[PDB]
Amino acid sequence: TKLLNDEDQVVVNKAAVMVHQLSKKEASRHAIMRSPQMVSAIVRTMQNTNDVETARCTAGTLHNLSHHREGLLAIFKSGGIPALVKMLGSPVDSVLFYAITTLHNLLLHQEGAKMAVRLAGGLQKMVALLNKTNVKFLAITTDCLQILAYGNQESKLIILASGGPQALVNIMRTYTYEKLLWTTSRVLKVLSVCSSNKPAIVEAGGMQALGLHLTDPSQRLVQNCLWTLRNLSDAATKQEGMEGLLGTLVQLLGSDDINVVTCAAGILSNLTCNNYKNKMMVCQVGGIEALVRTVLRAGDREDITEPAICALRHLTSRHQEAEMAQNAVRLHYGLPVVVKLLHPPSHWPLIKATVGLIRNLALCPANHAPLREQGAIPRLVQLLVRAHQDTQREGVRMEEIVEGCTGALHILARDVHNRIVIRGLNTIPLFVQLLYSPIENIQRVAAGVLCELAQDKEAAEAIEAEGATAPLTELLHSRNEGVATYAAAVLFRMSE
């Protein structure tokens, strides 16, 4: 060794290519590993040289040392990790490749590495390199990152800072090389669990890109994509150009894999939230029928049934094709099972959702007869009363069930036939006393159904007998706009 090391002239660049090849021999590589100065000579050199054949080689050696435990440790303790990182700057693709593969080694096995990479800027650099074109290279890099980001939030915030979400989202959108799409999907998912990073990932096109890969053959990917999309699915109610994603999901509902059927269902429930296009997209690719079919095929499995009903709940209201969707549910035999889900062993969350869906289906007049003829009413009341005591005297506040069941009855009360049942289960004395409730949301619905019930003379009498003019009128100046309006309508309807 001796001579080699020393030199500060045209002399040492010659010395350079000279050691890269002893690194190849086993007891030679092993040899230099047991030297303190042999390593720190490559290091100082590799960074402070400017001959593109001197670097390529010094880097090359380190890569060869990085396979063994005393190989790695000697590298690390030789302050090489600061160096290896500046080499991530080198234009020479032969060095980029030496460095990023090396570091990967370092992070995977060596102790105190992740810190050193971070502290030296590693992250902000590794994120800059995602514009490179070599897939074999990216997939390694997007791993180093996943390594540095796992269970470390400072790091995930710095990859947000750098424009990572864009970079990675571009990859998902450009390449098809699995090992890459995979390691890159893993990172996305890891950042998918951050307050901030979520919207970023979304706005960059995260949703639309992940879903090019749902019908992929590799399952170790379609997973990641599904899960990841599920996380983000609540940030993503704002986006456009989903036509693709929606239509795909609506087809994975057919998947004879329970754990993919739930994710398909979960994710839709969210992307159908509030966004009036997403609803229409979903309806036209036959989504109503797909959901119903999925609900029947799921039975007592409430991880599937809960989401799917929320989704049907969403699609049955507040968009141009909702009347379509309310009929669709009737025509594809959804009514009988929707109702049967108000029965045990359904749990309240699910029962909460299902009443909401029934509230909506009831707006469609065709669904008045059909819903009546499945005893949706007698059952809604059952729950209403059970619930209106669990309060007077969880998993969900019973107030929500009381409001839910009276709203649903409100809507159903529109049909004169229904109106007759409703009254004849001795409900009226119970509607009137809901007025006196601390919750306005409850007073609003209560007064609503009364208003409808009270379009019949004999009922207006019945409703007046309960002394309903006492609190309708003290609500007549209620803080709540909806509360106060209905009060007028019932009072107006008993005087005619």
Binding site: F97, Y98, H104, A139, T183, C273, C310, S317
Partner: peptide, 28 residues
Amino acid sequence: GDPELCATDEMIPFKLADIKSSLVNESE
């Protein structure tokens, strides 16, 4: 339609050897 057009929908909140060596020959 419905009284309640301004209503919101509730959202559920949810929560390489082969290529490394291959790359140092495309380096050599």
